[PDB]
Amino acid sequence: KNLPLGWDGKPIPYWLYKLHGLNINYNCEICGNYTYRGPKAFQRHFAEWRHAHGMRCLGIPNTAHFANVTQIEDAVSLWAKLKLQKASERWQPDTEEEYEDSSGNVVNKKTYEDLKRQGLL
Amino acid sequence: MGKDYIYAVTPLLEDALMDRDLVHRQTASAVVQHMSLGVYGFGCEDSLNHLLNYVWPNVFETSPHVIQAVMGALEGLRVAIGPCRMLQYCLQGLFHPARKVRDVYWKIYNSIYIGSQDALIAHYPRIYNDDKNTYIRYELDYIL
Amino acid sequence: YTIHSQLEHLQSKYIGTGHADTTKWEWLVNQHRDSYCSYMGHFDLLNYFAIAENESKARVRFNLMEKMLQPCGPPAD
Amino acid sequence: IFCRKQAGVAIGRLCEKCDGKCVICDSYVRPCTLVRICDECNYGSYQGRCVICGGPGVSDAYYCKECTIQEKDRDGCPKIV
Amino acid sequence: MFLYNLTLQRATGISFAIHGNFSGTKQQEIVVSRGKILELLRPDPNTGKVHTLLTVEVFGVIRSLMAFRLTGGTKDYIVVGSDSGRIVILEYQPSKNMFEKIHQETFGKSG
Amino acid sequence: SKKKLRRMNRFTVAELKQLVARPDVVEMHDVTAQDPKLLVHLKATRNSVPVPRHWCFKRKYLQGKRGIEKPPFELPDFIKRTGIQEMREALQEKEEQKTMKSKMREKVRPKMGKIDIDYQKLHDAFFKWQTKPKLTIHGDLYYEGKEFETRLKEKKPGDLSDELRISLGMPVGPNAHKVPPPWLIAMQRYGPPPSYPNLKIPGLNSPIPESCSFGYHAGGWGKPPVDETGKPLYGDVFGTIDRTPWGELE
Amino acid sequence: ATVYVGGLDEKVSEPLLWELFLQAGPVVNTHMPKDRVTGQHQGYGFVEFLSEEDADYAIKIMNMIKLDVGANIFIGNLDPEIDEKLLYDTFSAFGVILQTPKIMRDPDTGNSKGYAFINFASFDASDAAIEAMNGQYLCNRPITVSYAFKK
Amino acid sequence: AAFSVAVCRFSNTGEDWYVLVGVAKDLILNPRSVAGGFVYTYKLVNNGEKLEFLHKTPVEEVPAAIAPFQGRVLIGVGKLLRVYDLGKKKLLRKCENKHIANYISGIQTIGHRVIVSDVQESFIWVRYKRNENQLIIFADDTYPRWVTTASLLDYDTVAGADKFGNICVVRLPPNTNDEVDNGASQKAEVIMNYHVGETVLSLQKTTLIPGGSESLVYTTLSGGIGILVPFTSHEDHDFFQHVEMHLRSEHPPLCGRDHLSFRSYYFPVKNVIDGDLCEQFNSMEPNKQKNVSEELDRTPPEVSKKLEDIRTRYAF
Ligand SMILES: [Zn+2]
Ligand SMILES: [Zn+2]
Ligand SMILES: [Zn+2]
C-alpha cells in the first residue's frame, strides 16, 4: 500500500498520511533527479548530503543563496550574477589602487610596479 | 519603582514564556504589559527587548484570553520600547502569502498605527519606485 | 463581528490603517501623505527644505500641499 | 460595546458598586484625569449615571494613570449602552 | 553616561505672530511663536523699542496661533492649536507676568 | 478561473531568485503571495524580524514541549545569597510533617514570629548586588527547543575550558597558554584544516605562549612544525588612543 | 568529513567536542547518536569536518587526546608521562578495558621504569591494539605491546 | 556646486598646505540626478592668505565629504569610500571600499579609526589596515538615523544629530575585535536618546569657561544653542531625576502635551534630564515650589541653588 514507516515500522493511518501529505513529490534536479515525498523533508534535503554533493560537483558551493533553486541552468545563472556582485563589492587594489608615475601621469598599482621593476620606475 | 526588580524578574518570565501552558503564557504576558508601562522612560529597554523575543511568537494564537493578553503586552511594550522596534517586528508579515498571518499583522500594525502614527514617519522603510509610480521620498534625502 | 462593525468603523476612523489584503499602493501612499502632513506641521523640517532648495516657506508649503494629491504615481491596476 | 461619539465637557459618574475602578483598564489605583462624556449619552434619564453599572451618579469616574500615559482617554464617551 | 540638557540662547526665529490688546488696555501686545516657545513682546511707542516681556516654554509644536476677542470684552485671549490632540485657550496676567490656561479640550491623539 | 490565471502569474522560485537583488530570503511559499517583489524587499530590509517558525505547523505552539521532564526554576544568585531558600525549605518540611489536629491547634495558638531574616540583607541584595542578567538583543525570537543548544558560533580555536582541559588531559588556568592541547600535537604532526585552516595553533602554528618550553617530554612545545628547508608548517610556530568615555559617573 | 569518535568518553560533552572541532577546523557536525535508552556516550560517534583534509589532520591531532581467560596485554617501553583516563581511552580504541593499565612502576619513588599491563575486552582486541602499536609511536618511548604474562 | 572642504598637508610633500574642495556638477534635487564631481585642490599660499588653483580631478558623484587621514585624505563620493594620495596631474586613489549603504554625508576619524556616517542608515565604523592597505567594516548601528552631523567623544563613542530633531550617543561595546577581516558582523549600542526639538546642525565636544568641565554644544537650525553636560555623582543625578519626575506631574506644559512623550517623540528617552523643565522651578508658584521641594525635603533655597550652580560650573 506504499504506507510510510513509523518508528515501529508499520503503515501510517490514512488521515495522518493525508496530513503529512506524502503524495506530493518534489523533483530535485541537483540530487541526481532524486524526487522527495514530504515537504519539510524536501526542504531539509537542501542541506542534506545528496544536495551538498550535487552542489560541489555543480561547481558552486552549498551556500543558502541557491537553496530551493533546483534546476541547474537557473543555479548557474544565479551564481553567475552572484559571482559578478562579489567581484564588484570586493575592493581590488590592482585595478582600484592607482599610482602616478613621476611624469605627471597616472597608472594603477599593477602597471606601476610592472614598469617599475622591469626597469624604469 | 520597578526599575529595580525588572532584572530579577526577567529570567522567570522567559522561563514561563517558553511553554508551560496556555495560562502560563497568558499570565507572563500580562506581567510584561505592566512592567513595560511602569518602566516607561528609565532605560530598561534591553530587558523588554529580550522579552519581546519570547512574547512575539505567541502572536499566532486562538484562545481569546491568550491572544488578548498578548495584544495587551504589545501595546504596553509599544510605549515602553518605542514604535520602531515594533514596526520592524511587524514588517515582513504584512504582505505574506497566507491570510491568518496577514490578518494578525494587520491587526497589530493597526494598533501600532492608531497610537503613535506620527513617529512612524521617520521609521518607514525605503520602498523603491517602479515604472509608473514614484515611491521614494526625496523630501527626506535633500542634503543640507 | 459587531467588533467588525466597529473595526471597519475604525478603518473609517483612522485614515492610514490596513487589513490583511491591503495593497502596496495604499500602504505606501498613506505613509507618503502622513509624511507631508508632518513636514508641514513641524516648523523646522520646513526650514530644512526651504533652505535645501532655494525656495521660501510659502513656496515650500504650496508645493507640498499640491503634491499631497497624487504623491506616489497613479493608481494600481 | 462603546458609544465613542466624540468627547465633551460633561463629567461622568460612578455608582457605588462600580466605585473605584477605571472605565476600561479596570484598575483601582492612581487615577489622574477626570472622565468626560458625549451629549447624547449625557441627556435625560442618563444624566448622572454609572457608565458601567448604570446606577446613580455619585462618585466620579476617573482614568488610571496608565490609560493617560497611553492616551486611551482621548476618544470620548465610552458608554456601554 | 548621564547627561543634563541646558539651553543658553533660546530659539530666536519667528514662525507665527498675532497682535492684540493682550493686557486689556489699548496698548497693543504681540504674541509670536518660536519653535517650541511662546514669546510675548510689547512695542513701546515712545522710542520704538520692543520689550520682550514674557518668554515661556510649551514643550510641543505650535502649528497654529490665533488671538480672539470676546464680543465686547476688553481682553485678547489666545487660541493655540499645537501637536497634541488638544485645543488650548491662553491669557496674560501682567500681575504675575504669566500665561494662564482658561480651557482645555482633547479631541484625539498626539503628534 | 481567475485565481488560476493569477496562478499562472504565480512565478517560479527560480524566477524570483534570479529577479531579486538579495536572494538569501526567497523561501517556499513566498510565491503564492499577492506581491512577492514587495514581500522579498521587505524580508531583505535591515533589522526586520521574520515571522515565527510555527504558522505552517499543525501542532500548536509548545504542545511539542509536552513530552519531556523539566527542572524547577533557578533563582538569581543575589537572592540565594540572602539565604531565603533554606528558611522556606525548613518551614516546608515542618508543615508537611504536622498533622491536621496540630495544624488547627497552631491556627488557634500561632507560633508567632517563628523565624527572622533581617533587612539590609534583603535591601543590600536588591540595591547593592543586583546585576544585569543575560539578555538577547533585537530579533532573536525564542522558538521551541531553542534552549536545546546552550551556546555556539565560537569557531575560534583558542577557546578552551578548564573542565575541558581536565577531561582532555591539559592544564587549567595560567597554564592554558603554555599548555598546547593534545590536538595541537597532531596539528604539529599532520596539520590544522584543508579548506578551513584560518586557525593557527599555539605552539604548533603560533609562537610560544608566554614562557613556553621547547622539549619532547610531557609539558613542552616539541618540534614547531617546519619544512625541511626551515619554514614552519604555517605562520610562525617558533616566533620571529585614549579610550576614556566623555560622560561617565563618579 | 565523517570521523569515528572512538573510545568516545561518557561525560566528555558534545559541546566541548564541537568546540575542539572548531579549535581544529570546520566544526560542522559533532554527534554521538547514542543508545535510545541510556543518553550517555555510545563509544563511537560521527564528527563531520566539512573539509576532508581538515578532518584528516584534526583526527591525527585529536587521537591520543585524553578524553578472565587472559584478556590482558603487556605493554612496555612504556610512556611514564601519561594519565589514567587518557591511557585507558587510548587502549580502549579496540575494545573495553576491564582493568585500567596497571603500570609496573617502582615503589621507592613513584616514577616508572617503563612497563605495564592492561586488561582489555578481547584477546583479539589486545592483538589488534598491540599490532597497531607494536613498536609504534608512543609518547616519548615508543610502544611495544603484546599478550601479557601471568604473575 | 561646492559641498565639502578640508585643509591638509600630504606627507610625501612637506608643509605646503592644500585646500581640497568637493564640487559636484549639474545636479537636480527633486528628482535626483547629477553630472559629476570634481576635486578642487588649491595651494593656499601667502602663508595661507590666498588660494591658487592646482587641479580639479573628475570623479563619479557629488563628492560630499573630505577628511584628512594619516598623511592622505579619505573621500566620500556617494556610495564609495575611497582613499586618495597626491599628484599634480590629478589625484590618485590608493584605496577603495564599496560597502556603504546609500550615500556618505560624513567622515570623522580618530588617530586610526573612521566613523563614516551615511545619510540614512547610520554611523558605520571602518578600519584602515595600512600594510595590507584595506578599508574594512567591523561595527555599525542597529537603527536608521538620518544624520546631519556627528562628533567623537572618545575612541569608542560617537554622538550624532538627526534631521528630525534627535541627538543620540552611540557607543561601541567595550570589547571590540577591532582588527579582523543582518548586514554587518558586530554592532554598537545606544546610550542616550534625546529629542531636542529642532534640527541640530552641529555638535562639538568643548569646554566654555576656563577650567569648566567638558561639555557638548549643540546648535540647532532655529537660532538655538545649548549644551549637554555629564553628571559626576548619583547624588546630583538622582536629585534632578526626582526634581523633574515630580515637575512633570504637577506642572505640565502649557500646550496640551506630555513632557515624557515630547522628549521621546521618535525613540524613547534614555539618560537625559530636561534642564529646561528643571529650570522652571524658579518661575513656578510658592505653593507648588513648597509642595515639590518638600517632597525633596530640601528647602526651595536648596533646590534653586543646586539648580543654578550646575549651570554655574559648566556654562553661564
Ligand atoms: Zn480603562
Ligand atoms: Zn453617546
Ligand atoms: Zn456602577
XYZ file of C-alpha atoms in Angstrom, chain E:
111
model
C 26.617 58.326 30.581
C 24.170 60.611 32.361
C 23.513 63.994 30.877
C 21.802 67.239 31.744
C 20.421 69.419 28.967
C 20.638 73.199 29.071
C 19.713 75.897 26.595
C 21.814 79.002 26.698
C 20.203 81.143 23.998
C 16.562 80.453 23.241
C 15.393 79.948 19.712
C 15.168 83.329 18.059
C 13.479 82.726 14.705
C 9.817 83.650 14.490
C 7.136 81.475 12.959
C 3.745 82.845 13.958
C 2.520 86.143 15.303
C -0.680 87.725 16.471
C -1.407 91.278 17.524
C -3.965 92.219 20.101
C -4.544 94.039 23.344
C -3.314 91.070 25.297
C -3.278 93.126 28.520
C -6.788 94.602 28.201
C -5.509 98.134 27.533
C -5.300 99.831 24.160
C -1.560 99.462 24.254
C -1.219 96.529 21.883
C 0.867 93.416 22.556
C 2.338 90.954 20.065
C 2.460 87.207 20.722
C 4.918 85.385 18.492
C 5.901 81.750 18.460
C 9.425 80.427 18.200
C 9.750 76.711 17.673
C 8.537 75.215 20.958
C 8.193 78.562 22.686
C 5.562 81.243 23.143
C 7.096 84.689 23.440
C 5.245 87.942 24.031
C 6.609 91.392 23.202
C 5.185 94.853 23.766
C 6.390 97.617 21.418
C 6.893 100.932 23.159
C 5.565 103.854 21.079
C 7.985 106.332 22.644
C 11.383 105.178 21.411
C 10.006 102.480 19.169
C 11.756 99.740 21.162
C 10.021 96.415 21.701
C 10.426 94.875 25.139
C 10.234 91.072 25.212
C 8.039 90.715 28.253
C 7.268 87.038 28.581
C 9.079 84.040 27.115
C 7.576 80.678 28.007
C 8.156 77.011 27.218
C 5.317 74.844 25.974
C 7.074 71.569 25.138
C 5.215 70.846 21.938
C 4.908 72.222 18.486
C 2.957 75.390 17.779
C 1.284 74.588 14.484
C -1.340 77.316 14.724
C -1.807 80.525 16.666
C -4.759 82.887 16.627
C -5.910 85.579 19.024
C -9.526 86.456 19.560
C -11.661 88.974 21.427
C -14.967 88.080 23.025
C -17.961 90.087 21.926
C -17.412 93.268 23.902
C -14.804 92.285 26.491
C -11.587 94.221 26.803
C -9.156 91.263 26.814
C -7.464 89.346 23.983
C -7.441 85.602 24.510
C -5.183 83.246 22.550
C -6.280 80.030 20.864
C -3.348 77.701 20.310
C -3.517 74.623 18.167
C -0.456 72.510 18.751
C 0.583 68.950 18.055
C -1.242 67.329 20.933
C -4.803 66.272 20.390
C -5.963 69.393 22.185
C -7.037 72.978 21.616
C -5.885 75.335 24.346
C -7.005 78.797 25.467
C -4.496 81.222 26.931
C -4.494 84.647 28.585
C -1.972 87.125 30.027
C -1.699 88.062 33.681
C 0.589 91.115 33.895
C 0.104 90.889 37.660
C 2.008 87.604 37.682
C 3.503 88.084 34.188
C 2.317 84.682 33.142
C 0.195 82.876 30.599
C -2.930 81.321 32.074
C -4.839 78.301 30.783
C -8.563 79.021 30.712
C -9.880 75.901 28.983
C -8.610 72.656 27.515
C -10.285 70.277 25.080
C -8.977 66.916 23.967
C -10.128 65.648 20.617
C -7.642 62.996 19.519
C -4.112 61.672 19.518
C -0.691 63.271 19.777
C 1.985 64.030 17.283
